[PDB]
Amino acid sequence: SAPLGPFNATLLEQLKNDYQKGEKEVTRYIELQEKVAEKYIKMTPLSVTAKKKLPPSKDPRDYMTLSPYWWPDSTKIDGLPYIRKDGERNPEVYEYPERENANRFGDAAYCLGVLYYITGKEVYAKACANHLRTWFTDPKLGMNPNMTYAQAVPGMKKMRGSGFIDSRRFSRALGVAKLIEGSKSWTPSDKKKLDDWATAFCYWMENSTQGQRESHAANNHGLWYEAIHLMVLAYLDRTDRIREVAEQSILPKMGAQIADDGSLPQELKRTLSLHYSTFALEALMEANQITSQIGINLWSTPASNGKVASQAVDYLYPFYLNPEDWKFKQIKPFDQSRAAILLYEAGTALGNQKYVDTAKRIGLKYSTSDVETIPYLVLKK
Amino acid sequence: SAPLGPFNATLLEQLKNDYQKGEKEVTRYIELQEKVAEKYIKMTPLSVTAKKKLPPSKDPRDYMTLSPYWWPDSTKIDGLPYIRKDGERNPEVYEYPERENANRFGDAAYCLGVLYYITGKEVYAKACANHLRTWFTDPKLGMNPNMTYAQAVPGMKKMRGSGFIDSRRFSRALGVAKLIEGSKSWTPSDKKKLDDWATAFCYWMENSTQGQRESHAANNHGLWYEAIHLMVLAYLDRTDRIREVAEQSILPKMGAQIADDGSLPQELKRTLSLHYSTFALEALMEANQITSQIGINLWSTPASNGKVASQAVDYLYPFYLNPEDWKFKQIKPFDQSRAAILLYEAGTALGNQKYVDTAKRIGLKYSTSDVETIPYLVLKK
Ligand SMILES: O=C(O)[C@H]1O[C@@H](O[C@H]2[C@H](O)[C@H](O)[C@H](O[C@H]3[C@H](O)[C@H](O)[C@H](O[C@H]4[C@H](O)[C@H](O)[C@H](O)O[C@@H]4C(=O)O)O[C@@H]3C(=O)O)O[C@@H]2C(=O)O)[C@@H](O)[C@@H](O)[C@@H]1O
Ligand SMILES: O=C(O)[C@H]1O[C@@H](O[C@H]2[C@H](O)[C@H](O)[C@H](O[C@H]3[C@H](O)[C@H](O)[C@H](O[C@H]4[C@H](O)[C@H](O)[C@H](O)O[C@@H]4C(=O)O)O[C@@H]3C(=O)O)O[C@@H]2C(=O)O)[C@@H](O)[C@@H](O)[C@@H]1O
Incomplete structure (x- = not known):
């Protein structure tokens, strides 16, 4: 353990x-x-x-x-x-x-x-x-x-x-x-x-x-703030504060930043809108790694208004299949490979086998030295 | 003088x-x-x-x-x-x-x-x-x-x-x-x-x-090579070599790189094809600044194969008006302001009033500190 x-x-x-x-x-x-x-x-x-x-x-x-x-x-x-x-x-x-x-x-x-x-x-x-x-x-x-x-x-x-x-x-x-x-x-x-x-x-x-x-930031800055917050708190073993941050800050942020169709409007107005949509969800992904070690699943836990982070993944999934389909400003190419770990993390947390399969189909290179890929042998076969 | x-x-x-x-x-x-x-x-x-x-x-x-x-x-x-x-x-x-x-x-x-x-x-x-x-x-x-x-x-x-x-x-x-x-x-x-x-x-x-x-390079490297060559030769007052380089190397190389519709195929295969199409012509432009001081106009003098550099400007001109219309890979946004000095140089060399008018319409900022714009008060309003 x-x-x-x-x-x-x-x-x-x-x-x-x-x-x-x-x-x-x-x-x-x-x-x-x-x-x-x-x-x-x-x-x-x-x-x-x-x-x-x-x-x-x-x-x-x-x-x-x-x-x-x-x-x-x-x-x-x-x-x-x-x-x-x-x-x-x-x-x-x-x-x-x-x-x-x-x-x-x-x-x-x-x-x-x-x-x-x-x-x-x-x-x-x-x-x-x-x-x-x-x-x-x-x-x-x-x-x-x-x-x-x-x-x-x-x-x-x-x-x-x-x-x-x-x-x-x-x-x-x-x-x-x-x-x-x-x-x-x-x-x-x-x-x-x-x-x-x-x-x-x-x-x-x-x-x-x-x-x-x-x-209090209205976009991915507030999400990343709390992901960093949880790293510091987990290091200090403050599990009750992790519960409090998830319920009082992360979930309200998710409820406010995800629109009804699952888009992230604060990221849609950026010149790298597909990158920043993904970066918002990467903040949630790293936060979820910590909260789910104490029984809180951020991918499926609703905000007070019923919205769930899985809605944000659903909106973006076709564009992870085909970044060329993306219809908002993206003034540099999107690196599809970042969807591998993200779709794997969200897929397992949600039991969405289609997300997991896509994560493996995109994959990570077996021999890569990228240190964030160390735990993910499952994506390297 | x-x-x-x-x-x-x-x-x-x-x-x-x-x-x-x-x-x-x-x-x-x-x-x-x-x-x-x-x-x-x-x-x-x-x-x-x-x-x-x-x-x-x-x-x-x-x-x-x-x-x-x-x-x-x-x-x-x-x-x-x-x-x-x-x-x-x-x-x-x-x-x-x-x-x-x-x-x-x-x-x-x-x-x-x-x-x-x-x-x-x-x-x-x-x-x-x-x-x-x-x-x-x-x-x-x-x-x-x-x-x-x-x-x-x-x-x-x-x-x-x-x-x-x-x-x-x-x-x-x-x-x-x-x-x-x-x-x-x-x-x-x-x-x-x-x-x-x-x-x-x-x-x-x-x-x-x-x-x-x-x-000997078949793309913009060969054009820039000769533009640099002319700067060195002009610095040394070797006007006879400048004429020889213009007649025996720049014009044949420029002529070999222009296709029948005036496109530059070597630059179209780049991920920044509009940037590199423009960069190729900027080599010719700086070369022409030197050749035209001894009576050689590189924009209007045809090569041995009948191709003339004005054909390349004609191909790119609509895309300087509207860079968004470019239909080849350009994985970063194109700086339209680069077309100002180019169209002015080629426009003046060719007697093309439509190029010069567009050059002034795109323009350069009056107070910019960009040193290459110093001679171009004519583009600053
Ligand atoms: O390269 C890196 O360091 C990493 O960058 C990561 O992107 C971050 C940037 O580092 C910036 O912090 C950037 O800040 C943005 C804000 O998100 C926001 O868009 C803000 O917008 C303001 C704007 O500044 C202006 O005042 C206007 O009138 O109002 C806007 C508004 O509030 O809508 O501008 C900030 C800025 O650019 O200073 O944001 C990103 C981010 O969103 O996280 C990231 O790309 C990472 O991958 C890099 O490694
Ligand atoms: O950043 C800067 O200093 C300036 O860069 C300017 O663009 C230059 C680059 O600096 C490079 O030199 C780049 O070299 C290219 C060649 O032009 C060519 O595409 C070559 O392609 C080869 C390839 O390397 C490989 O061997 C393959 O099998 O064959 C290819 C082929 O011959 O088709 O690759 C070179 C490379 O990338 O190493 O080219 C550009 C240029 O075209 O001038 C410029 O962007 C400037 O604005 C910057 O300030």
């Missing part, structure tokens, strides 16, 4: 059971995953402090990125204030090292923690712990538990909480830290410091103005 | 003449351009050596970039060899600093040299000179005169010349250096070093295997 965390616990337990029983398909699969994971054992742990351009706090431990759709205005002498081009990512985002480094850290810690849970090999806990300590708790290298300067925008006058959605890149690693508890490498002192960091980060996201505003 | 260089000499001459006569509309325009150019006066000159990851030569003065559409293969343990996804730019390109630094250098040197030509103010030549010396001729900071490691691809076994097309970002700056000849800041020694660098770069692109291959 897997510890509470941000993953499909059923697939992880099934993998760990079959690996321990010596089943050959799984054992061979885990040996490939172990060869993929070797680069993470070697990898020097990253830190948010590895930047030259400092945030307005002057603190290198404050996370800071550029909001991706904001560009210099060439008709202004200094390019200020920046203006928005929805769906067009400003390559200036890559000047903020934590944008990609949070992803690299998150990939490394997630892969290593999952492999330590499956195999029991201490070398994976040791490396996972080294990534965790440097990113989160180190008194010089760890990030401050806030997202004050996430997705800042040059020239913008008002505070926004929009950058909080960046947190999903390290909050999954926070959740996976639970899997290395009880190893020799993760000491009681390591756990306390991370518990304290997670408590401070949870306080910030629940009580800061930016956190409050993001918690 | 303006020196031979990579610009619309007719518009530059008209700007300098009206500025010197004190015409208010032009005088006000140049004062805006001077405010825009102030950042280039202050800006620290860039160098190709400002990289940590060195090229296989171990020489920081060797230019190196990643070919943009090549991505790690996630089904390989080390991601090697990279694989191609046409039209999808891999953000790893921004890890090679000279990719964007060549752009920044090119903008600053072009703007400063043009403003010195128009205004005669020594401060623009002095700053222009500082950028040229550091980028090109400095014995520690200047780039080696080759493109051996331009658009390298990890894991790729064969040499390619495809990265030569990067050169357009600094070959325009090379060409405008002619505009500061005779200033106090550009000494006879500065000229000799740049002449010698340009001679060596001309030798490399004509005689290296990579240069030979790029010169």
Whole structure:
């Protein structure tokens, strides 16, 4: 029985059971995953402090990125204030090292923690712990538990909480830290410091103005906010708060954001409307991984108005079959492969065999190193 | 008469003449351009050596970039060899600093040299000179005169010349250096070093295997190769070679790439077929800016096979009016504003009033800081 965390616990337990029983398909699969994971054992742990351009706090431990759709205005002498081009990512985002480094850290810690849970090999806990300590708790290298300067925008006058959605890149690693508890490498002192960091980060996201505003967002930002919220809460073992968040925030959001025909109108008005419809449901999918570990199925549980997330999948399913049929603005091609895990997660939760079959028909590559696909051998045959 | 260089000499001459006569509309325009150019006066000159990851030569003065559409293969343990996804730019390109630094250098040197030509103010030549010396001729900071490691691809076994097309970002700056000849800041020694660098770069692109291959390319690479060739040759005042390149290479190559309906089949098979159809003609446009200064009009002179570049504009013109009508793959939106200067250049060269009218109707913003628009007050209202 897997510890509470941000993953499909059923697939992880099934993998760990079959690996321990010596089943050959799984054992061979885990040996490939172990060869993929070797680069993470070697990898020097990253830190948010590895930047030259400092945030307005002057603190290198404050996370800071550029909001991706904001560009210099060439008709202004200094390019200020920046203006928005929805769906067009400003390559200036890559000047903020934590944008990609949070992803690299998150990939490394997630892969290593999952492999330590499956195999029991201490070398994976040791490396996972080294990534965790440097990113989160180190008194010089760890990030401050806030997202004050996430997705800042040059020239913008008002505070926004929009950058909080960046947190999903390290909050999954926070959740996976639970899997290395009880190893020799993760000491009681390591756990306390991370518990304290997670408590401070949870306080910030629940009580800061930016956190409050993001918690009330009318589109996929509010859904992702609560998915991140559940990762922090599950890490801290606050299962009653997970129940409260699901009933008092996630379900009302679903009832409000799904229209009667199952479309997501807030995502339909975006220039990448098929991507953002899918991204909304991906937030629910990762939230559901956590709630269903305590008996709450977000795919089939109605809001007060009777709407259910399965209605959102039904609306999009034909377009996952044929993205070319999509009738709203989508100014870059849609990657059909993201529907694999999503249709599998929703399909199993709903007992919809047609969703599961489609997920397997789309599939994932057997040998892919994409760390989010580790639990999904079921999609790789 | 303006020196031979990579610009619309007719518009530059008209700007300098009206500025010197004190015409208010032009005088006000140049004062805006001077405010825009102030950042280039202050800006620290860039160098190709400002990289940590060195090229296989171990020489920081060797230019190196990643070919943009090549991505790690996630089904390989080390991601090697990279694989191609046409039209999808891999953000790893921004890890090679000279990719964007060549752009920044090119903008600053072009703007400063043009403003010195128009205004005669020594401060623009002095700053222009500082950028040229550091980028090109400095014995520690200047780039080696080759493109051996331009658009390298990890894991790729064969040499390619495809990265030569990067050169357009600094070959325009090379060409405008002619505009500061005779200033106090550009000494006879500065000229000799740049002449010698340009001679060596001309030798490399004509005689290296990579240069030979790029010169033979059947698509827009071959057109840009010759546009760059003409910038170098014009910088060196080799007017006889310019005529020979125009007559014996550009026109046959342009003629070979135009189908019977005026489409460019090599560009139609790209995932960004409207962008690359336009990019092919932009090569011809910058080439024609140089050829027409010695009496050779590339828009109206037929090739050996009877094809003429005006046929390609005629094919694309309706789609510049309405880009949404384009019927070939274009997996990102097309920037209609790119058609303004193209239709003006071709329209003026062809005496086609309908092209010129559309060029002005699409227009360019009066206050834009885009340095390539500096000569085009005629498009700014
Ligand atoms: O690249 C990444 O970091 C990930 O991006 C993910 O998409 C996020 C972005 O990072 C932004 O946060 C983006 O914010 C949007 C809001 O969702 C919203 O559309 C907002 O709209 C405002 C608008 O700014 C303006 O003020 C107008 O007048 O009103 C609008 C309104 O309220 O309707 O604009 C924000 C913005 O662009 O700043 O949103 C997305 C998101 O929806 O999650 C994601 O694509 C991920 O895959 C990337 O990895
Ligand atoms: O990002 C930038 O620096 C600028 O990019 C400009 O577009 C260039 C690219 O930089 C690449 O060089 C790209 O190279 C293409 C070739 O044009 C060609 O399509 C080639 O196709 C090959 C293919 O690689 C393969 O070997 C196959 O079997 O055969 C194909 C064939 O010959 O048909 O692939 C190259 C590649 O992608 O490596 O081409 C463009 C270009 O056409 O100029 C430009 O977009 C500019 O705006 C950017 O600033």
